[PDB]
């Protein structure tokens, strides 16, 4: 029926797990062939919407409002597709489903076990992601270390998928970190011979191999591992360090890995033109760069590579599109928390400022000062989510003059709950508000920066927030010069702006999730143009 | 502070897992020691309440209303304790709890995993069973096959359990099926070597072996598995076929297993008297039997050993007590559905008839005929659960002449719903009724067989049913001769009887769950006394 490429290994992000699947996806898509990607996470969390972006990375949001693993973000950007809740499978969800069906007697008195009941849920979920996304081919990216307990049910599941569907429709691509000894030049097989066995032990035979390394693999090395892994030298392929993830697809066709792949399934097609992707890439490397802009980004977890991967990638798409070289100045919001130590030299240099999503109160003054600074010194500024909310707070305590304005999230007790939880229609409540998630509608006001940026009245961005602008405060804020240029169908404020400034925009939503290399977020476009002057 | 004996292996019932554990238990308790036993079922069902007793066996019921693995029944019968919901730990319940706690953000933004979140949950549950029961020693019986997926997390948890508290507080008894090849006399170690291999991979070193075999183990064959498994011969011990599992403690005391164990755990006591138990065993084996009595058991699943294990044991306990030898005549109830094929011969020989629990409708008529027959020929009869409900029916459509009388479970359309679901007071309803579970008060009527059997007015039996006697029909059922000797706190009919017969008693509850070697169910005592005249 369908085809299936199963990928394992990774075990890290330095290894390129997600991008390789995304790359492979993109190359198939250009060949007429319909494709979809699916990521499996063998952890117990039902989904990613309670997970700390620290230690774990950004939480991606699909158009349908699922909170997922960032890997779907790689998929969306590379294959230019909309993901769904079904493209991210977690042990958490599977276990929940099986337990619920048992409790409902849907198993008719059987004793429900891993095999086959759990393994069957996995296959139903894989196969379902195939049919609802209309795919002839389906990548299944399997997280974790092969041979870890958590991985077994998913490995066994795909081993079975191979007995059922046949070798002419199910293949495995494994990703191994080659790394020559610290002081010898000879490679450490130990992890690598440790893997191939665990796969055989679980009953899986790799067809293609991707060795991850700084530098391509010599002729020798590749013939060596070819042995341990029992794979044909013809089918081992290289993943070497590279200046941008977007190159990955191009190094893969220079090796034709997807050609080898397609045959191995018994399909046929060719003549892919990347010229359009190729130029996008060269624009990413700074080639024919018209300038260099510094953007300060202010939040926490800033040392984590993937904590804000989508904002970062959206900055790249906007820049690359208008030919400009982004330089990112990450600033921990605490390093700003000093009525002492001044900052008109820390951000005197940057040509634009962004206050990051993500809440609590860890560094909310640092973030608020950075905003005050952007607004007062007319530095182009973009507010996202918690950032947008601190704009309301900053504007109210400084321009409006409410010294006590705050979010109830930070101080549930403030005299002026300028940001707060709301109920479906009343609207103020310390209940538990209404969490907005996914693609939602935003009605732009004509004449504003927002309307211009989008070039139309009605648009959509993905949401992931619960704290809203208090409606009681809206009007006196407008009177103080703040403009609501965006509201929800039911009147919640979506986009604020200050026309008095060259570029001052904030938004509850996350437009970065929609950014594509060939289709940058419009919000991020306006910001990056303003920034670049 | 707590000692733990972890018991692995016995991939099934004939291998003796349940009883071995149960025997070691009872032998400990007879010494100074506070002891409990815990059964782990690596399956995904949350509890045993949804399960078909075919394939899997009889569902046990605790005093507390838990629906559980039948192994808790062995623990009760052998050690003479009431078990709790905590003494049956399921993979279904662990995952349910962990997942729920995650969805509750109890894991504070962490990515929740098998290790350590699942293994922690399991440890918590094992530890909790210990303390709520108040044990200094806790037997942890781990079902399934060592080295299978569903088992890992529990094996991993018991490894951690050890490296934590010490080699002096946590030991491993592994049960291996010793089975010499078909035609050569030498033993097939293949599965055995494969198991001690699956344990080291998991990092578990067995301390004692128990080789399950037909005959005791010779000097040669035990010495050998001692090597394969790296265990001192002095710590290998034989489990061989015996007439009754109640013999197992005895053969373990001969081999002094529990004495070898007590040391390896650095504890000291002794002088145990089994004289009271030896005698009970001899009665069970029929030594000095006063006569043999034939009992028919009518129901379904009669070909599986453990589908009604507790009903049998209750029969054995009462028979042994009054010094008589029971022979059970298993009768599929379909073998009696026959407007031909008369029966004053199939049942002509039996002096006792019990109609079995287990609803549905498969062989409902056969069970009904059986009930007509014992009532009419005055064969002492015991009806139980769906048996009781059928008695009520038979009585209706025959003596009381209501040809359409029936339970709503068998035909919700019947003209006379003499048995049906009832809502929380009212009481007639086809909603979903009110499920009765575990120990429950029953008020006995004075001057009845039931009152006589208990020698008191207020008593408890464990329940497991929803379909009750329709209150409307009570009053006429009574006038036609039926006696209600038992009702609930709120007037639901619990026990009935027909004083016109020498013994014809049916009860909603399951009195067999409480029966002990020393302390027979008063209901089973009565029945067996009546049967034997």
Tab-separated table of C-alpha atoms in Angstrom, chain B residues 210-436:
chain	number	residue	atom	x	y	z
B	210	UNK	CA	14.081	-23.813	42.367
B	211	UNK	CA	14.037	-26.384	39.609
B	212	UNK	CA	10.484	-27.351	38.779
B	213	UNK	CA	10.445	-30.954	37.594
B	214	UNK	CA	8.347	-34.079	37.814
B	215	UNK	CA	10.759	-35.954	40.032
B	216	UNK	CA	13.166	-34.501	42.607
B	217	UNK	CA	16.498	-33.391	41.174
B	218	UNK	CA	19.350	-35.891	41.240
B	219	UNK	CA	22.885	-35.102	42.444
B	220	UNK	CA	24.086	-34.716	38.851
B	221	UNK	CA	21.454	-32.433	37.243
B	222	UNK	CA	21.234	-29.875	40.026
B	223	UNK	CA	25.001	-29.534	40.272
B	224	UNK	CA	24.899	-28.666	36.579
B	225	UNK	CA	22.321	-25.887	36.614
B	226	UNK	CA	24.339	-24.591	39.588
B	227	UNK	CA	27.079	-23.789	37.089
B	228	UNK	CA	24.896	-22.437	34.270
B	229	UNK	CA	23.491	-19.976	36.783
B	230	UNK	CA	26.458	-19.416	39.017
B	231	UNK	CA	24.733	-20.487	42.223
B	232	UNK	CA	26.035	-22.545	45.147
B	233	UNK	CA	24.546	-26.052	44.981
B	234	UNK	CA	23.523	-25.760	48.646
B	235	UNK	CA	21.136	-23.078	47.386
B	236	UNK	CA	19.505	-25.081	44.617
B	237	UNK	CA	16.277	-26.754	45.634
B	238	UNK	CA	13.686	-29.125	44.115
B	239	UNK	CA	10.041	-28.434	43.259
B	240	UNK	CA	8.422	-31.714	42.120
B	241	UNK	CA	4.897	-32.906	41.379
B	242	UNK	CA	2.813	-33.520	44.454
B	243	UNK	CA	-0.796	-34.604	44.825
B	244	UNK	CA	-1.715	-31.300	46.454
B	245	UNK	CA	-0.017	-27.890	46.411
B	246	UNK	CA	-0.651	-27.851	50.187
B	247	UNK	CA	2.218	-30.337	50.234
B	248	UNK	CA	4.704	-27.740	48.921
B	249	UNK	CA	5.423	-26.137	52.290
B	250	UNK	CA	6.252	-29.542	53.695
B	251	UNK	CA	8.705	-30.440	50.937
B	252	UNK	CA	10.343	-27.021	51.397
B	253	UNK	CA	10.728	-27.619	55.153
B	254	UNK	CA	12.336	-30.958	54.393
B	255	UNK	CA	14.799	-29.203	52.101
B	256	UNK	CA	15.028	-26.338	54.619
B	257	UNK	CA	14.810	-23.680	51.907
B	258	UNK	CA	13.348	-21.077	54.240
B	259	UNK	CA	16.184	-21.751	56.718
B	260	UNK	CA	18.796	-21.166	54.030
B	261	UNK	CA	16.951	-18.027	53.090
B	262	UNK	CA	16.649	-16.650	56.615
B	263	UNK	CA	20.427	-16.695	56.953
B	264	UNK	CA	21.308	-15.134	53.616
B	265	UNK	CA	19.172	-12.295	55.012
B	266	UNK	CA	20.868	-12.307	58.428
B	267	UNK	CA	17.769	-13.028	60.538
B	268	UNK	CA	17.235	-15.554	63.327
B	269	UNK	CA	14.311	-17.601	64.614
B	270	UNK	CA	12.956	-21.146	64.314
B	271	UNK	CA	10.851	-23.783	66.035
B	272	UNK	CA	7.968	-23.931	63.606
B	273	UNK	CA	5.193	-26.399	64.148
B	274	UNK	CA	3.547	-27.807	61.037
B	275	UNK	CA	1.859	-30.638	62.937
B	276	UNK	CA	-1.445	-28.772	62.567
B	277	UNK	CA	-0.724	-28.399	58.857
B	278	UNK	CA	0.451	-31.944	58.297
B	279	UNK	CA	-2.869	-33.154	59.672
B	280	UNK	CA	-4.811	-30.826	57.377
B	281	UNK	CA	-2.761	-32.152	54.459
B	282	UNK	CA	-3.530	-35.783	55.333
B	283	UNK	CA	-7.254	-35.038	55.357
B	284	UNK	CA	-6.828	-33.455	51.910
B	285	UNK	CA	-5.086	-36.605	50.691
B	286	UNK	CA	-8.019	-38.724	52.017
B	287	UNK	CA	-6.155	-40.578	54.758
B	288	UNK	CA	-8.824	-41.883	57.165
B	289	UNK	CA	-11.586	-40.747	54.812
B	290	UNK	CA	-15.067	-41.570	56.123
B	291	UNK	CA	-16.538	-41.803	52.627
B	292	UNK	CA	-16.397	-40.428	49.090
B	293	UNK	CA	-18.978	-37.874	47.897
B	294	UNK	CA	-19.636	-36.881	44.300
B	295	UNK	CA	-20.306	-33.249	43.491
B	296	UNK	CA	-21.508	-31.948	40.166
B	297	UNK	CA	-20.256	-28.533	39.096
B	298	UNK	CA	-22.325	-26.980	36.347
B	299	UNK	CA	-21.093	-24.032	34.349
B	300	UNK	CA	-18.697	-23.075	31.611
B	301	UNK	CA	-14.903	-23.259	31.296
B	302	UNK	CA	-14.906	-26.464	33.371
B	303	UNK	CA	-11.925	-27.880	31.450
B	304	UNK	CA	-9.457	-25.200	32.633
B	305	UNK	CA	-7.901	-25.976	36.029
B	306	UNK	CA	-7.945	-22.536	37.637
B	307	UNK	CA	-11.175	-20.983	36.338
B	308	UNK	CA	-12.933	-21.714	39.670
B	309	UNK	CA	-9.926	-22.491	41.823
B	310	UNK	CA	-11.451	-20.980	45.006
B	311	UNK	CA	-14.729	-22.815	44.726
B	312	UNK	CA	-12.650	-26.013	44.574
B	313	UNK	CA	-10.410	-25.112	47.509
B	314	UNK	CA	-13.459	-24.226	49.534
B	315	UNK	CA	-14.871	-27.677	48.708
B	316	UNK	CA	-11.524	-29.237	49.667
B	317	UNK	CA	-11.276	-27.231	52.917
B	318	UNK	CA	-14.777	-28.188	54.080
B	319	UNK	CA	-14.398	-31.854	52.959
B	320	UNK	CA	-11.077	-32.248	54.703
B	321	UNK	CA	-12.541	-30.703	57.838
B	322	UNK	CA	-15.396	-33.186	58.140
B	323	UNK	CA	-13.075	-35.937	56.954
B	324	UNK	CA	-14.594	-36.833	53.588
B	325	UNK	CA	-13.285	-37.428	50.046
B	326	UNK	CA	-14.745	-35.212	47.285
B	327	UNK	CA	-14.864	-36.103	43.626
B	328	UNK	CA	-15.753	-33.268	41.332
B	329	UNK	CA	-17.929	-33.932	38.344
B	330	UNK	CA	-17.435	-31.122	35.897
B	331	UNK	CA	-20.401	-30.610	33.634
B	332	UNK	CA	-20.510	-28.102	30.822
B	333	UNK	CA	-23.977	-26.616	31.145
B	334	UNK	CA	-24.576	-27.007	27.392
B	335	UNK	CA	-24.441	-30.802	27.815
B	336	UNK	CA	-27.748	-30.374	29.646
B	337	UNK	CA	-29.632	-28.184	27.184
B	338	UNK	CA	-31.670	-30.946	25.631
B	339	UNK	CA	-35.422	-31.466	25.343
B	340	UNK	CA	-34.199	-35.001	24.704
B	341	UNK	CA	-31.148	-36.547	26.277
B	342	UNK	CA	-32.612	-36.936	29.753
B	343	UNK	CA	-30.482	-36.724	32.845
B	344	UNK	CA	-31.776	-38.653	35.874
B	345	UNK	CA	-28.561	-40.476	35.066
B	346	UNK	CA	-26.028	-37.746	34.317
B	347	UNK	CA	-26.878	-36.319	37.740
B	348	UNK	CA	-28.361	-39.464	39.222
B	349	UNK	CA	-25.037	-40.378	40.777
B	350	UNK	CA	-24.136	-37.042	42.386
B	351	UNK	CA	-25.128	-36.212	45.950
B	352	UNK	CA	-24.309	-32.534	45.493
B	353	UNK	CA	-24.875	-29.935	42.852
B	354	UNK	CA	-23.305	-26.506	42.542
B	355	UNK	CA	-24.255	-24.148	39.749
B	356	UNK	CA	-21.275	-21.959	38.847
B	357	UNK	CA	-20.710	-18.190	38.714
B	358	UNK	CA	-20.111	-16.539	35.388
B	359	UNK	CA	-22.883	-14.837	33.536
B	360	UNK	CA	-23.460	-14.309	29.834
B	361	UNK	CA	-26.049	-16.697	28.427
B	362	UNK	CA	-24.019	-19.348	26.662
B	363	UNK	CA	-25.357	-22.331	28.601
B	364	UNK	CA	-27.985	-20.621	30.760
B	365	UNK	CA	-30.638	-23.301	30.185
B	366	UNK	CA	-28.361	-26.156	31.153
B	367	UNK	CA	-27.710	-24.418	34.440
B	368	UNK	CA	-31.450	-23.881	34.886
B	369	UNK	CA	-32.267	-27.555	34.260
B	370	UNK	CA	-29.645	-28.461	36.829
B	371	UNK	CA	-31.382	-26.199	39.323
B	372	UNK	CA	-34.812	-27.664	38.546
B	373	UNK	CA	-33.310	-31.092	39.078
B	374	UNK	CA	-31.706	-30.646	42.475
B	375	UNK	CA	-34.688	-28.783	43.898
B	376	UNK	CA	-37.101	-31.442	42.639
B	377	UNK	CA	-35.024	-34.540	43.581
B	378	UNK	CA	-33.871	-32.937	46.813
B	379	UNK	CA	-30.174	-33.094	45.917
B	380	UNK	CA	-28.346	-30.703	48.257
B	381	UNK	CA	-27.666	-27.704	46.105
B	382	UNK	CA	-25.381	-24.675	46.254
B	383	UNK	CA	-25.953	-21.775	43.866
B	384	UNK	CA	-23.470	-18.914	43.430
B	385	UNK	CA	-23.599	-15.465	41.798
B	386	UNK	CA	-25.176	-15.960	38.392
B	387	UNK	CA	-26.108	-19.294	39.940
B	388	UNK	CA	-28.155	-17.562	42.633
B	389	UNK	CA	-29.774	-15.341	39.992
B	390	UNK	CA	-30.672	-18.457	37.977
B	391	UNK	CA	-32.121	-20.174	41.036
B	392	UNK	CA	-34.385	-17.160	41.481
B	393	UNK	CA	-35.441	-17.569	37.868
B	394	UNK	CA	-35.975	-21.301	37.927
B	395	UNK	CA	-38.079	-20.807	41.006
B	396	UNK	CA	-40.146	-18.198	39.249
B	397	UNK	CA	-40.931	-19.875	35.926
B	398	UNK	CA	-41.556	-23.234	37.566
B	399	UNK	CA	-42.862	-23.417	41.147
B	400	UNK	CA	-44.297	-19.895	40.841
B	401	UNK	CA	-45.177	-20.546	37.208
B	402	UNK	CA	-43.873	-17.454	35.397
B	403	UNK	CA	-42.763	-19.060	32.121
B	404	UNK	CA	-41.211	-15.759	30.932
B	405	UNK	CA	-39.264	-14.984	34.124
B	406	UNK	CA	-35.597	-14.157	33.441
B	407	UNK	CA	-32.713	-11.784	34.117
B	408	UNK	CA	-32.551	-8.632	32.004
B	409	UNK	CA	-28.940	-9.643	31.206
B	410	UNK	CA	-30.162	-12.707	29.245
B	411	UNK	CA	-33.114	-10.962	27.596
B	412	UNK	CA	-33.758	-7.363	28.561
B	413	UNK	CA	-37.209	-7.754	26.948
B	414	UNK	CA	-38.597	-10.511	29.198
B	415	UNK	CA	-42.143	-10.025	30.516
B	416	UNK	CA	-40.953	-10.712	34.072
B	417	UNK	CA	-37.583	-9.047	34.923
B	418	UNK	CA	-37.261	-11.030	38.126
B	419	UNK	CA	-33.535	-10.350	37.924
B	420	UNK	CA	-32.354	-6.965	36.711
B	421	UNK	CA	-30.158	-3.944	37.277
B	422	UNK	CA	-31.395	-1.371	39.816
B	423	UNK	CA	-30.240	2.230	40.321
B	424	UNK	CA	-29.054	3.809	43.578
B	425	UNK	CA	-32.458	3.400	45.289
B	426	UNK	CA	-35.807	3.652	43.400
B	427	UNK	CA	-35.045	1.145	42.264
B	428	UNK	CA	-35.947	-0.279	38.835
B	429	UNK	CA	-33.599	0.860	36.030
B	430	UNK	CA	-31.812	-0.220	32.837
B	431	UNK	CA	-29.100	2.395	33.257
B	432	UNK	CA	-26.000	0.548	34.395
B	433	UNK	CA	-27.005	-0.401	37.907
B	434	UNK	CA	-24.803	-0.336	40.963
B	435	UNK	CA	-21.691	-2.567	41.069
B	436	UNK	CA	-21.179	-4.411	44.363
